[PDB]
Design a protein around this ligand. Structure first.
Ligand SMILES: CC(C)c1cccc2c(-c3ccc(CS(C)(=O)=O)c(C#N)c3)c(C(=O)O)[nH]c12
Ligand SMILES: [Zn+2]
Ligand SMILES: [Zn+2]
Length: 231
């Protein structure tokens, strides 16, 4: 019942967590540079199909994700969106693509993934290139808030449930640092978070890219930890 944490999930196993009717997060763990990290994605019911947001950070984790979805939900994943180019978002796209899932990302994300040597979603999402842009994609809205954790980061809103999936632009409340900032724009990040706050004032659940969901306070907390990391 509690939201599952990094030491509770062996690398290679995937958990699902019911967020709202027709909305789950997925949680998996992965090793990177000799440390183990949890990470989140989203699953949104789309009639008798499912929309997936982000991989489970790796090929075997993503295969395990598909198996867990089949076990717990039993509807086919037909489309996936990756919310930026890092491996916790796109690692596993090749698995998805071999399992019949149509994979999508912005053109920015696709370029960055290619240049990084990461797996590359098949389809480009136009209409998201300027901050404040929004497009519909099945049962969600995709929103580009501006550069933050990465220049390409997208956020996802589930209007039926008022669920805001911030991805790696949003940190959990326990965070003390701004995470992996190698590709971040620390100066623009608080402005991008303000755009999220202004666009989604009715959000009831906010899900970070890593760690525990909460409410709207995750947004201000994120701005705070980013400003303090820069400063
Ligand atoms: C480039 C990708 C694949 C990657 C690799 C390894 C770690 C990360 C982290 C991360 C997340 C949360 C935390 C704890 S925190 C908020 O308290 O710093 C930490 C730490 N330490 C790292 C992120 C991220 O920030 O999106 N991406 C990562
Ligand atoms: Zn990232
Ligand atoms: Zn991340």
């Amino acid at each position: 019942g509690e939201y599952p944490t990094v030491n509770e999930i062996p690398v290679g196993e995937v958990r699902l967590y019911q967020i709202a009717d027709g909305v789950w997060s997925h949680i998996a763990t992965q090793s990177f540079d000799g440390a183990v990290y949890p990470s989140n994605g989203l699953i949104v019911r789309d009639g008798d199909e499912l929309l997936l947001i982000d991989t489970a950070w790796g090929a075997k984790n993503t295969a395990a994700l598909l198996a867990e979805i089949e076990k717990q939900i039993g509807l086919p994943v037909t489309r996936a969106v990756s919310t930026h180019f890092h491996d916790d978002r796109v690692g596993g796209v090749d698995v998805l693509r071999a399992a019949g899932v149509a994979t999508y990302a912005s053109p920015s994300t696709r370029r960055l993934a290619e240049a990084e040597g990461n797996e590359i979603p098949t389809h480009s999402l136009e209409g998201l290139s300027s901050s404040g842009d929004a497009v519909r994609f099945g049962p969600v809205e995709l929103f580009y808030p501006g550069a933050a954790h990465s220049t390409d980061n997208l956020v996802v809103y589930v209007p039926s449930a008022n669920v805001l999936y911030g991805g790696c632009a949003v940190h959990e409340l326990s965070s003390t640092s701004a995470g992996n900032v190698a590709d971040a724009d620390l100066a623009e990040w608080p402005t991008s978070v303000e755009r999220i706050q202004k666009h989604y004032p009715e959000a009831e659940v906010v899900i970070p890219g890593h760690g525990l969901p909460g409410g709207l306070d995750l947004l201000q907390h994120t701005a705070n930890v980013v400003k303090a990391h820069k400063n």
